[PDB]
Amino acid sequence: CTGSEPVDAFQAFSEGKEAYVLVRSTDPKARDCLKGEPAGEKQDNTLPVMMTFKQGTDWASTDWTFTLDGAKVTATLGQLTQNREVVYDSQSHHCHVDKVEKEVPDYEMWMLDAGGLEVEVECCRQKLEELASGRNQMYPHLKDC
Numbered sequence: 001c002t003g004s005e006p007v008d009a010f011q012a013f014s015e016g017k018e019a020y021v022l023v024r025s026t027d028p029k030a031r032d033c034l035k036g037e038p039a040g041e042k043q044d045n046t047l048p049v050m051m052t053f054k055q056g057t058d059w060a061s062t063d064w065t066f067t068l069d070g071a072k073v074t075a076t077l078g079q080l081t082q083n084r085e086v087v088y089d090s091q092s093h094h095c096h097v098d099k100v101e102k103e104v105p106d107y108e109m110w111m112l113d114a115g116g117l118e119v120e121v122e123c124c125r126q127k128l129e130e131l132a133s134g135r136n137q138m139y140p141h142l143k144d145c
């Protein structure tokens, strides 16, 4: 299950050309149907992204600025900041696993919303299990999305 190495966030995001959906999270507060979609070309070391999600039955969308530094991703919206590091990226950049850096860290698995490359998907799941062993996983994309 060796993936893409060394890990690079821009590469993990298919060079800002694709949308990714959150499929596994250890965070009980993870947004239902969370998806990230590029909203413009890379500008310097940043990438504009729209994050879409569903709250109850209502769809919502927020505008974030991603600052990339190797495998590190700093996402900002107004006074809000979320820090992550991409810790595993599949061979073809089809899925990846993040560590969400904060007091009690959380882990996430994101993937292209397209089908295929099941072996790479299984590898991401295995890697998430290793990084987050013993943590309960929730499934944000299995929320009638």
Ligand SMILES: CCCCCC[C@@H](O)C/C=C\CCCCCCCC(=O)O
Binding pocket: 013, 016, 018, 019, 020, 031, 035, 036, 037, 038, 049, 051, 053, 062, 064, 073, 075, 082, 084, 098, 110
């Ligand atoms: C670029 C296309 C999307 C890629 C997604 C990358 C994935 O590694 C996650 C990286 C940053 C996630 C930022 C989450 C911001 C919270 C959004 C929901 C909200 O408004 O609370």
